[PDB]
Each structure stands twice: as C-alpha cells, then as structure tokens.
Amino acid sequence: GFIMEFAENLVLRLMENPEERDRKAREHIYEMHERCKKIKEMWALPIRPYGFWTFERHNAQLRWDPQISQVAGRRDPYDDLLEDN
Amino acid sequence: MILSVLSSLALVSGLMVVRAKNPVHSVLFFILVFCDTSGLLLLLGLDFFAMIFLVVYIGAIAVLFLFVVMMFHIPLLPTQRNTTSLRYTVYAGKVRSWTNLETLGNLLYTYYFVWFLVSSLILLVAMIGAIVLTMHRT
From CA A46, how far away is CA A50, in angstroms rounded? Predict the structure, then answer.
C-alpha cells in the first residue's frame, strides 16, 4: 500500500486501552488510600505495648525460680528443719 | 563512736591524698585510706572483703604505685529507749549458718559464672597490655 494507511493503524496499535487505564487509575487510588489508612493506624502504636511484662518472654523468672528454690542458699529457714520426716 | 572516728580519719587521709606535696606521701596516705576502709568493712560484718582489701588494694596495687613512685622521680531518730529490747531473733536459720565466703563461692562459680570468665579475660588483657607496652629488652 502507501505510507499513511499503515502508519495510521501502527499508531493505533502503539496507543493503549483507555478503559484499562481508567480502571487501573481508580483501582490504584482505592488501594493506595486503604494502605495509607493502614500506615496511619500503624504509626499510632506506642513504643511500649500495653501487655509488655505480661508477655511470656518478659518474665523469665516465674518459671525459673520454682526449680531453684530447693538449692542451698535460697531455702526458707523452715524447710530443712522438718524435711527430715 | 568507732565508726565516726574511723570515717573521719579516712576522710582526712583521702583529702590529703589529692593535696599532697610529694607522690611518696600521697601513696602513703593512699594506703591509710584503704586501711581505714577495710576496718569500716570489718565493722560492717564482711570479714572476707575487709581482708581482700588488704590483699589487693594495699597488697598489690599500693605496692605497684609505690614501686612506680620510687623510680621515675528516712533515718531513725537516735531515741532508742524502747528499741534495744524489741529485737526478735529467729533462731531457725542460725543452725547451719554460712560465712561470707561459703555463701559467695556457692553462686560465684556456678550460677553467675560468665561474669567470672569475663573478669578472667580482663585480667588477661591487663597482663598482655603491661607487656606489649613496656618490653624494651635492650
């Protein structure tokens, strides 16, 4: 053929779907705003959590001392006296 | 009254340590400071530390300093009318009563044994450092 009859549909192939572009734009806005709200919530967390000491890793002694309160140097004076019988 | 005079003499010796005229007398008063301090610890009831203070402070550190100096030249109110008779003694626990040494050694080498090895590493650092710096050997 001639030049323009091919350059026309060439440019038309080069250009994209606008419906896809609009859908992607509204989508991206939706999830970006949702993620923005999520990050805003995340930044509100205090440095020290409400539980803190309640956490099992932050006790480390309520389940260690009971198995140590029997060794010498930690016993209540009234433990060795009546342990004989 | 034994505590007051001892503390005062220790304070005077410590004051004269920093305003001394020559290093020899400074070290001499430095020794007396630890002597009084060990006496004070002895009054406190810790005989072991009171004598380690002689063994280490005025046994090795004071000797080291002297060697270097030789060359290179709410409270309760004092009313106690009815408190010396209100002492309740729990006889349980007096039987099999450990000293300041057995109690310390019970848990120094067994439970808190990492810090003991850290102190060993500190001693090794000191031993190595005293050699690397000062070996002229000419």
Answer: 8
